[PDB]
Amino acid sequence: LTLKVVTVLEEPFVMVAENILGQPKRYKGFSIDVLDALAKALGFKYEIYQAPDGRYGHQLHNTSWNGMIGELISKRADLAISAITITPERESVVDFSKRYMDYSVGILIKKGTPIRTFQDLSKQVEMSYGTVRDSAVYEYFRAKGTNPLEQDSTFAELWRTISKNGGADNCVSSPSEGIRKAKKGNYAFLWDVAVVEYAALTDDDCSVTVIGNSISSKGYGIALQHGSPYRDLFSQRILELQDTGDLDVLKQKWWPHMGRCDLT
Amino acid sequence: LTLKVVTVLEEPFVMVAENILGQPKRYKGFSIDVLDALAKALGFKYEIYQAPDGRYGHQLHNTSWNGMIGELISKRADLAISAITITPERESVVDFSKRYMDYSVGILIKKGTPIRTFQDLSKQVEMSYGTVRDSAVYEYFRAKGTNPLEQDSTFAELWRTISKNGGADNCVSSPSEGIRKAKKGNYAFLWDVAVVEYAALTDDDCSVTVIGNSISSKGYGIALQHGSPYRDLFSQRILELQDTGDLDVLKQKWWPHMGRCDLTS
Ligand SMILES: *[C@@H]1O[C@H](CO)[C@@H](O)[C@H](O)[C@H]1NC(C)=O
Ligand SMILES: *[C@@H]1O[C@H](CO)[C@@H](O)[C@H](O)[C@H]1NC(C)=O
Ligand SMILES: [Ca+2]
Ligand SMILES: [Ca+2]
Numbered sequence: 001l002t003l004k005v006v007t008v009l010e011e012p013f014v015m016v017a018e019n020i021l022g023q024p025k026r027y028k029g030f031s032i033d034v035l036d037a038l039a040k041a042l043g044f045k046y047e048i049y050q051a052p053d054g055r056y057g058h059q060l061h062n063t064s065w066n067g068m069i070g071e072l073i074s075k076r077a078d079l080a081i082s083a084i085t086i087t088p089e090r091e092s093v094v095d096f097s098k099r100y101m102d103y104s105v106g107i108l109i110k111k112g113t114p115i116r117t118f119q120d121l122s123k124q125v126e127m128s129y130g131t132v133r134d135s136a137v138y139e140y141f142r143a144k145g146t147n148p149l150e151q152d153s154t155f156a157e158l159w160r161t162i163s164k165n166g167g168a169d170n171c172v173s174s175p176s177e178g179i180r181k182a183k184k185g186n187y188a189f190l191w192d193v194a195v196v197e198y199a200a201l202t203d204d205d206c207s208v209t210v211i212g213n214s215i216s217s218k219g220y221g222i223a224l225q226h227g228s229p230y231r232d233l234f235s236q237r238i239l240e241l242q243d244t245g246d247l248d249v250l251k252q253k254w255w256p257h258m259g260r261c262d263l264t
Numbered sequence: 265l266t267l268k269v270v271t272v273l274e275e276p277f278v279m280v281a282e283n284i285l286g287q288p289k290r291y292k293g294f295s296i297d298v299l300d301a302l303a304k305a306l307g308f309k310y311e312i313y314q315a316p317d318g319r320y321g322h323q324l325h326n327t328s329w330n331g332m333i334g335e336l337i338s339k340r341a342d343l344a345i346s347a348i349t350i351t352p353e354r355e356s357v358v359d360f361s362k363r364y365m366d367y368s369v370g371i372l373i374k375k376g377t378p379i380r381t382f383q384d385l386s387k388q389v390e391m392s393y394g395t396v397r398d399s400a401v402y403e404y405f406r407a408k409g410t411n412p413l414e415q416d417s418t419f420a421e422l423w424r425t426i427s428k429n430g431g432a433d434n435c436v437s438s439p440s441e442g443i444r445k446a447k448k449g450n451y452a453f454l455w456d457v458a459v460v461e462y463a464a465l466t467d468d469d470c471s472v473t474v475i476g477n478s479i480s481s482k483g484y485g486i487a488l489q490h491g492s493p494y495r496d497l498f499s500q501r502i503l504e505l506q507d508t509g510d511l512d513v514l515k516q517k518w519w520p521h522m523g524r525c526d527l528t529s
């Protein structure tokens with residue numbers, strides 16, 4: 001049995017191995033390791049191709065999806081894996097396995113600052129902070145920072161800074177821009193903990209650290225075609241992998257407990 | 265439409281509401297609120313009864329299950345809810361929805377100590393610590409503390425203290441004993457962060473704090489009969505609750521940000 005897998009490059013979830021003349025195009029990463037574990041246990045081969053538009057997927061005007069989600073709906077892909085978050089809108093058109101990792105928003109900041117939490121960040125006027133404009137993270141802080149029922153007034157303060165001038169002043173256009181500004185100092189970037197954590201661990205100067213403190217708001221999962229019988233099987237193995245600690249071993253392979261940069 | 269819901273008391277997930285004058289025994293809690301949200305969204309009624317043995321359920325020697333899991337397998341209950349963690353052993357015989365809350369192991373300890381992380385606790389010779397004897401948390405530390413591949417030596421150190429004399433020296437019979445010993449002092453209790461955090465928030469003397477910082481090892485979910493058509497429906501609305509922020513509001517209702525004991529040393 002062979003399955004078609006659609007993916008999008010996202011360090012360290014899915015990465016292209018260094019090109020070597022006379023060798024094929026290989027993929028590596030934490031998500032590839034999870035897929036290999038499922039492939040070995042469930043006994044299936046797979047072929048990986050990247051989404052032609054390189055997008056996770058969002059709904060279009062005519063109720064059609066692009067990106068990896070579109071591939072699953074069109075049945076051009078049996079499953080999709082990268083850094084896909086399990087969201088209600090996606091789960092209504094595809095079927096996600098139970099998460100194999102948590103998702104949360106962290107703060108990428110230069111080392112040595114007195115800021116250690118979101119509350120500390122919200123009380124700062126010296127250091128600007130923000131996220132990627134017109135992203136789910138930006139909308140996440142719109143909801144939290146405008147919800148009357150939120151007890152913690154930190155989000156309201158954060159939203160005022162993030163949304164200044166429609167977000168133009170304090171937000172960036174892509175995660176790479178946010179990471180760059182954070183390393184220069186005088187700016188704190190709010191994005192996926194996993195992405196920023198890997199960015200800080202691989203920093204050439206080890207000049208940046210990551211603030212967690214956020215319980216998971218979503219989880220990364222494997223997306224499969226609607227009604228796919230593999231969804232329950234994938235979830236069972238994923239739970240077993242988490243239970244035995246093997247998934248923790250894979251995480252530390254790409255997010256080492258002690259690596260190049262010390263984040264303390 | 266009505267569904268049979270099996271549960272077990274677990275503060276603050278499921279709790280008995282103060283009832284008077286022979287009025288029906290009503291339940292309250294974070295898990296009850298999630299159930300009510302699903303009931304309104306999916307348009308079903310329900311009746312809650314407690315597990316006759318008051319147990320979450322585990323496999324017996326003859327492969328039969330007791331507790332809430334047994335009620336689902338025997339189909340005396342349509343779904344089970346309380347503080348049930350989504351585990352592979354249970355998921356093989358029942359069907360869990362996607363988690364509606366994260367689960368992790370925290371530390372309940374008296375305030376005013378230098379201990380602020382698991383690593384700090386592992387380096388202590390003065391203060392004993394442990395978890396519930398013959399518990400999933402006890403097995404969790406057995407695996408981490410004996411796995412050669414774990415990069416953090418903290419877990420190996422913790423296991424030696426937790427498992428001393430087979431755990432007889434430093435473990436406790438129940439969470440209530442663990443909470444009581446932690447409040448006494450000279451003991452740190454390792455258990456569900458949600459349970460101990462509510463224990464610290466409701467402490468009469470506000471004498472204890474909780475050390476979290478642990479990413480979720482599992483998640484709390486709703487258990488349904490194998491092949492139940494409601495499982496996917498529950499997962500969908502559970503996801504929608506989280507996205508709209510309604511789950512966070514309910515959590516703050518039972519784990520308030522302020523108002524209760526301050527958990528800072
Ligand atoms: C819907 O929009 C997409 C654009 O991605 C287009 O490819 C597709 O042909 C459109 N129409 C229909 C009928 O699917
Ligand atoms: C297994 O043993 C238990 C005794 O605790 C009993 O109640 C149950 O009925 C047994 N199961 C079967 C299938 O006989
Ligand atoms: Ca679905
Ligand atoms: Ca991480």
Ligand SMILES: [Ca+2]
Nearest residue numbers: 347348349456
């Ligand atoms: Ca429990």
Ligand SMILES: [Ca+2]
Nearest residue numbers: 355356358359
């Ligand atoms: Ca199952």
Ligand SMILES: [Ca+2]
Nearest residue numbers: 412413414415
């Ligand atoms: Ca080693």
Ligand SMILES: [Cl-]
Nearest residue numbers: 097098361362
């Ligand atoms: Cl699921």
Ligand SMILES: [Cl-]
Nearest residue numbers: 480481482483
């Ligand atoms: Cl998890």
